[PDB]
Design a protein around this nucleic acid. Structure first.
Length: 95
RNA sequence: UGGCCGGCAUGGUCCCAGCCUCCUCGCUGGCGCCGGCUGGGCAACACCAUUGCACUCCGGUGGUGAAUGGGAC
């Protein structure tokens, strides 16, 4: 069951051998052109590794970034993108 | 040596270079042989497992079971 459009895009299948700080940076490097990015959450834990939440200011940006970067080779692996199941707190604190 | 002990072997103190290492990366650390016990930590590094939807940091195991020569007194 697919997901509905969201301010945040959920990315996975990311190279797990990359340190958190570097990954967030590199991610911003290739995603900031789709629109303002409020934040990028990355965790290296057993349950959260290989994934990331890029939180865009405007849903259109998440949408664009989703369609444009699906399958993009990143750190030797094809990035897999989706909309986040629910809203990130940073977003709730507003809309 | 991370912390502790035994056996053996071994002239000494320096100086240059090279190499070594999870546990004060370096010139007022170390770089003979052998055996036993044992602490911490995944921070880095490695290996294993993981395709996982968060907004609470948080899987496991491994390494020292290491590294040579030369020069002056």
């Amino acid at each position: 069951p697919e997901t509905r459009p969201n301010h945040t895009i959920y990315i996975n299948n990311l190279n797990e051998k990359i340190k958190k700080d570097e990954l967030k940076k590199s991610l911003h490097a290739i995603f900031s052109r789709f629109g303002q990015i409020l934040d990028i959450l990355v965790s290296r834990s057993l349950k959260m590794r290989g994934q990331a939440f890029v939180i865009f200011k405007e849903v259109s940006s998440a949408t664009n970034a989703l369609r444009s970067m699906q399958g993009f080779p990143f750190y030797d692996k094809p990035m897999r993108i989706q909309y986040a199941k629910t809203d990130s707190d940073i977003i709730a604190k507003m809309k």
